[PDB]
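Help! Submission page says 'invalid entity' but I think these are all valid:
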Amino acid sequence: EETIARWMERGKYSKLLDLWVKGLSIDWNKLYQEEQPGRISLPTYPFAKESYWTHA
Amino acid sequence: TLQVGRVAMEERIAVIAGTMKELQQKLTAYVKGQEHIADLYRGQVNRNQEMLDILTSDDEL
């Protein structure tokens, strides 16, 4: 996790993303050492639309 | 000699031992089919070829 911290500081973004996409867990909060950006509305998960009903 | 004097091939095992008797014990357990042996590791390169390629490039590792 420290090695990641150093890759981020050094900006080895390509490396982190090549590892992240294979499953490497990354604490994205460490990306922001000073201050924090703001949350905004973005599209949400497009849940599968499958029908389910019973019988009366 | 086994570290530096043998080409590392596809099927590998490795054992940590502090005495000869311990090594003989662990290797004999391996020969006898024991699936789990303490401080004896089994695996294959053939399996993890992909992640190997992509991680060893950097001296970081």
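Support: the input was valid. A stray whitespace character was the problem, and the output above is from the cleaned input. The interface with chain B takes residues 3, 7, 15, 18, 22 of chain A (CB under 8 Å).
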